[PDB]
Amino acid sequence: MVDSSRRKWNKTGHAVRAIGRLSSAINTEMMYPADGGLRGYTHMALKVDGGGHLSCSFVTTYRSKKTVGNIKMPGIHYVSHRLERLEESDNEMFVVQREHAVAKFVGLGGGGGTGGSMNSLIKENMRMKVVLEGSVNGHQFKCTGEGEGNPYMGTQTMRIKVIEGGPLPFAFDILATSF
Amino acid sequence: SRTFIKYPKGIPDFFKQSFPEGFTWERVTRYEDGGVITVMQDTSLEDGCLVYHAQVRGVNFPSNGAVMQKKTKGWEPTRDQLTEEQIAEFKEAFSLFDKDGDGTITTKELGTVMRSLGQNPTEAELQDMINEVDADGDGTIDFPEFLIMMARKEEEIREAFRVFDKDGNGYISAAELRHVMTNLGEKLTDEEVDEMIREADIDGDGQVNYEEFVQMMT
Ligand SMILES: [Ca+2]
Ligand SMILES: [Ca+2]
Ligand SMILES: [Ca+2]
Ligand SMILES: [Ca+2]
């Protein structure tokens, strides 16, 4: 048990830090229930030529399409990820990427500390197919891809083709986490 | 592609549980140089295969920046986190800011903490600060956003010390410390103030000097 008086100094130290300026970049993904829905807060760092980074952050709300049935909701937790590009063709019209991701326990939250319920529809290997479309700075495009992985081990690989609007006049990396 | 995250037994897996129906998501991404991308996605399961549909809209990316110039080289891993102990400490801090005990830090509460820690900041600034970490743009800081901000965080300790040391004699007395902690909204007895002094007071003179302060505060 942390001593009472020290907890006070620590929290006073935190309040001083919280109002101070000068923020680092951080690389983190925190999940937090909101609603019946699951929210994620993610800070990532995109490597740039010459060795700097462009810092980016995003907020995501995940919503279940199961409208009947009790889903056990998690509390606050983190996820560690490593997403690496394995191959690309020329001008990034073809991309192969893989990701390894693991959720991390940081205390009893929301749904107890008992897991929901194993879902017999998600097997040890699963394939995926993807369509992604849109625009960046007004440039329209469409990609499709396919892949596979091991959902219980957190590993997956995706092969993606830019089927319209290629070559993209922007870096494919900004789409990497969107499929 | 959230279905492929290894979830330990004790953390409910929101994604795997959602099948056969699946799930959707909406996402807003801000780059530090101004680019913004909005994404909507559907994840479905059709004949044993996972099927994704995504719609993206990015704007305001600098024409001369690395994204539009294609000078990027992939993503760093995402591996930083807080501990359970840190989250419990940060919750105690948060309540100093959340004096109505509602769940949200209004710009009113941030200004009062900054005021009692001696700061003199405008709405011009209290909105800049809150916007740097307002993930969802409602205009207040909730606890998850506070966590992010904290994780991202000498001259400022010096300022804090000058603020605690009301009479400027170089030493924080029990009475000085009680005044700041009270103004911060801490609920504690006078005994508890003395116990804070005693914790800090390595040289045993009954008061806290600058170096003693630094040690407690860092
Ligand atoms: Ca409040
Ligand atoms: Ca907010
Ligand atoms: Ca004094
Ligand atoms: Ca002393």
Numbering used by the authors:
A (entry chain B): 35 to 213
B (entry chain A): 217 to 369, 376 to 440
From the paper:
GECIs are prominent tools to monitor [Ca2+] in defined cells and intra-cellular compartments. To create a red GECI, we selected the red fluorescent protein (FP) mRuby (an engineered variant of eqFP611 exhibiting high thermodynamic stability and monomericity) and replaced cpEGFP with circularly permuted mRuby in the GCaMP3 scaffold. To aid our protein engineering efforts, we sought to solve the crystal structures of mRuby, RCaMP, and R-GECO1. High-resolution crystal structures of mRuby in several states, as well as a structure of a Ca2+-loaded RCaMP variant, aided optimization of the red GECI scaffold to useful performance levels.
To directly observe the chromophore orientation and the structure and extent of cp-mRuby/CaM packing interactions, both of which assisted GCaMP engineering, we solved the crystal structure of the early RCaMP variant RCaMP1a. RCaMP1a was crystallized in the Ca2+-bound form and its structure was determined to 2.1 Å resolution by molecular replacement. RCaMP crystallized as a monomer, consistent with solution measurements. Although the mRuby circular permutation was based on GCaMP, large differences between RCaMP and GCaMP in both the orientation of, and interface between, the CaM/M13 complex and the cpFP domain can be seen. Strikingly, unlike GCaMP, there is no large opening in the side of the FP β-barrel created by the circular permutation of the mRuby domain in Ca2+-bound RCaMP; the termini of cp-mRuby cross close to one another and produce minimal disruption to the β-barrel. As a consequence of the circular permutation, though, linker amino acids partake in β-barrel formation in the cp-mRuby domain of RCaMP1a: residue Asn143 of mRuby, which directly hydrogen bonds the phenolate oxygen of the chromophore, is spatially substituted by Thr294 of the second linker of RCaMP; the crystal structure shows that the asparagine (Asn61 in RCaMP) is co-opted into the first linker. In contrast with the chromophore in the structure of mRuby crystallized at pH 8.5, the RCaMP structure (crystallized at pH 7.5) shows the (4-hydroxybenzylidene)-imidazol-5-one moiety of the chromophore to be a cis-isomer. Closer inspection of the electron density map for the RCaMP chromophore revealed a discontinuity between Phe213 and Met214, which forms part of the chromophore (Met214-Tyr215-Gly216). The electron density map is consistent with imine hydrolysis of the RCaMP chromophore, resulting in a ketone on Met214, maintaining the extended π-conjugation of the red chromophore (thus 2-acyl-4-(4-hydroxybenzylidene)-imidazol-5-one), and an amide on Phe213. This imine hydrolysis results in a discontinuity in the polypeptide backbone of RCaMP, also observed by SDS-PAGE of purified protein samples.
